[PDB]
Design a protein around this ligand. Structure first.
Ligand SMILES: CCCCCCCCCCCCCCCCCCCC
Ligand SMILES: *Sc1ccc([N+](=O)[O-])c(C(=O)O)c1
Length: 171
């Protein structure tokens, strides 16, 4: 035999080990429209109808937003928009209320509850009305048979909705 000394500069004592990491995908939509009827005298919603263009999804990652349109997610080609229709607003007080409505994702429709929190009601310096409020709630992918081929392990069955609205009076 013969004896050797490592060249530390070109020797790597290495290892690879696989692990999992949980993180939240956060995202919104750039293109949507709403009709909003509200009574600042009573802090009640009368009509809230939202149409969201699935195409305009944004999770800050252009190749994912694209994949979201595919058959195994939104199927934007066949179901280009998702919609929410308020059916009933049960006021708790002037800050809080339970909102019930029909959400439709990829042509499947289900009634959901959102918690309305009114952040602010004002008459502007200009004399015209404004409001700020938030709707939030958890929906289940499984309830809408949404992205069914993706396991509830890889991607949570729960989606948390968070709608923040600033809005002004019309015409
Ligand atoms: C009223 C507002 C409704 C918003 C519902 C939006 C549902 C979005 C689901 C997104 C799923 C992201 C999947 C990421 C792929 C990684 C695996
Ligand atoms: S839009 C929205 C309203 C309220 C809350 N909240 O839990 O206080 C959230 C949230 O943090 O998910 C979002």
């Amino acid at each position: 035999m013969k004896e050797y000394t490592l060249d530390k500069a070109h020797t790597d004592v290495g290892f690879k080990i696989k692990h999992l990491q949980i993180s939240n995908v956060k995202g919104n939509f750039k293109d949507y429209s709403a009709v909003i009827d509200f009574d600042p005298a009573s802090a009640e919603f009368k009509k809230l109808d939202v149409t969201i263009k699935i195409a305009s999804v944004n999770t800050e990652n252009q190749t994912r937003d694209n994949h979201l349109q595919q058959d195994d997610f939104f199927k934007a080609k066949k179901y280009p928009d998702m919609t929410f229709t308020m059916k009933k607003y049960e006021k708790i007080d002037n800050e809080k209320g339970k909102m019930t409505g029909t959400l439709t994702i990829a042509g499947v429709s289900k009634d959901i509850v959102l918690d309305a929190e009114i952040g602010g009601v004002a008459k502007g310096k200009d004399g015209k009305e404004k409001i700020g409020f938030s709707l939030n709630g958890k929906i289940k992918r499984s309830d809408f048979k949404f992205a069914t081929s993706t396991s509830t392990i890889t991607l949570s069955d729960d989606i948390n909705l968070c709608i923040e609205v600033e809005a002004n009076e019309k015409e």
